[PDB]
């Protein structure tokens, strides 16, 4: 599977237009410079990614994957709220070079509407699995019963990019306000 | 004052820098390409800005300013909470141009440590005004006591620049339940 060409290739030079893209901007780099980045030729590089456009689509897709992986599953053995403020701490913890790029992808995003959209998908499919487990949390008596849970999503999403977004939240993230005074703020959004 | 020379011919580069760092991003923006928009020789433009970084350092300055006028004073005729939920909406209603300009900045300060400086000292200074207004509201028995402000005014900043940075933000905030659940979410964190 991930040992079956062309996958290490294509993974290989997404790495290189990960570590591009992060140091100089979508903007400014170049096909030719990911070319010279990951050292495939531009022949074989546009078989796999025909344009910048399909390059930051797979890394979007690379990170809306992330996401879900903390919201696919019903929880088992945390509480939500618990479970959100960890997921947060956790986003401060994260590949630092990663997280400078989600907020390239959002800058660029506010002047690409092409990206943009990506990025209406990539938060639609993380918004369904936030909702997905409010209603668990619901179901189960956990979490209040007059909540718009699209729009707590939507605002819970808003806060995490904006923390995502913070070169300080990791400094933050180390305190146990952080935590606690996150999870007031939690609990007053999904009424508990 | 603001009719004086330099400022005018000032304002019209800021304006300037302002549309191309916006459209294309600050990385790519040559100052050629500034004087080119700006209609200033290289001499005159750089008797104003040496750099690029004294351009982006001017402009979030501008952006600091315009957020401090929302907090600089105590309030008067509205709660604090009500004024937070406002600010918030208001926020999706701005320029959109600013607004794409707010993101870019985040992004390159990620990867630009001078422009990183650049903002803390930013939200140095409304983190004060905040923690100003939220002395205020405890002290006429408005929030509750044991709030970490700090930590709170940071992340109701991660809160506002994720919607500032969110392109259906606007949208959202068309809807009555925007201001609804982001009130449930201010009313915890501000422990009321
Ligand atoms: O979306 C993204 O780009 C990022 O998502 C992160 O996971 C989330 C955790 C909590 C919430 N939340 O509380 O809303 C939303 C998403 C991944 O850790 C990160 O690798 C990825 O870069
Ligand atoms: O800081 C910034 O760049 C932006 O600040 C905005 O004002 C704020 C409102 C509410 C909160 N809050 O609730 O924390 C913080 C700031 C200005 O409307 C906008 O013009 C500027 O671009």
Same mark, same amino acid.
């Given at each position: 599977? #991930?040992?079956?060409?062309?996958? &290490?290739?294509?993974?290989?030079?997404?790495?290189?237009?990960?570590? *591009?893209?992060?140091?100089?901007?979508?903007?400014?780099?170049?096909?030719? %410079?990911? *070319? #010279?980045?990951?050292?495939?030729? &531009?022949?074989?590089?546009?078989?796999?990614?025909?344009?910048?456009?399909?390059?930051?689509?797979?890394?979007?897709?690379?990170?809306?994957?992330? =996401?879900?992986?903390?919201?696919?599953?019903?929880?088992?053995?945390?509480?939500?709220?618990?479970?959100?403020?960890?997921?947060?701490? =956790?986003? %401060?913890?994260?590949?630092?070079?990663?997280?400078?790029?989600?907020?390239?992808?959002?800058?660029?995003?506010?002047?690409? &509407?092409?990206?943009?959209?990506?990025?209406?998908?990539?938060?639609?499919?993380?918004?369904?699995?936030?909702?997905?487990?409010?209603?668990?949390?619901?179901?189960?008596?956990?979490?209040?019963?007059?909540?718009?849970?699209?729009?707590?999503?939507?605002?819970?999403?808003?806060?995490?990019?904006?923390?995502?977004?913070?070169?300080?939240?990791?400094?933050?993230?180390?305190?146990?306000?952080?935590?606690?005074?996150?999870?007031?703020?939690?609990?007053?959004?999904?009424? *508990?």
């Amino acid at each position: 599977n #991930k040992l079956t060409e062309p996958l &290490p290739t294509r993974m290989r030079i997404l790495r290189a237009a990960r570590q *591009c893209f992060a140091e100089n901007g979508f903007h400014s780099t170049s096909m030719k %410079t990911i *070319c #010279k980045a990951s050292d495939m030729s &531009p022949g074989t590089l546009y078989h796999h990614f025909p344009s910048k456009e399909a390059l930051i689509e797979a890394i979007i897709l690379e990170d809306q994957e992330r =996401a879900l992986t903390h919201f696919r599953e019903p929880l088992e053995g945390v509480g939500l709220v618990d479970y959100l403020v960890e997921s947060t701490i =956790a986003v %401060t913890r994260e590949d630092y070079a990663q997280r400078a790029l989600v907020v390239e992808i959002m800058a660029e995003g506010m002047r690409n &509407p092409q990206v943009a959209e990506m990025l209406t998908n990539k938060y639609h499919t993380i918004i369904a699995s936030l909702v997905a487990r409010f209603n668990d949390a619901q179901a189960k008596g956990e979490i209040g019963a007059d909540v718009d849970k699209e729009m707590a999503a939507r605002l819970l999403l808003a806060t995490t990019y904006g923390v995502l977004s913070d070169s300080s939240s990791a400094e933050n993230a180390r305190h146990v306000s952080f935590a606690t005074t996150l999870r007031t703020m939690l609990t007053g959004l999904l009424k *508990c």
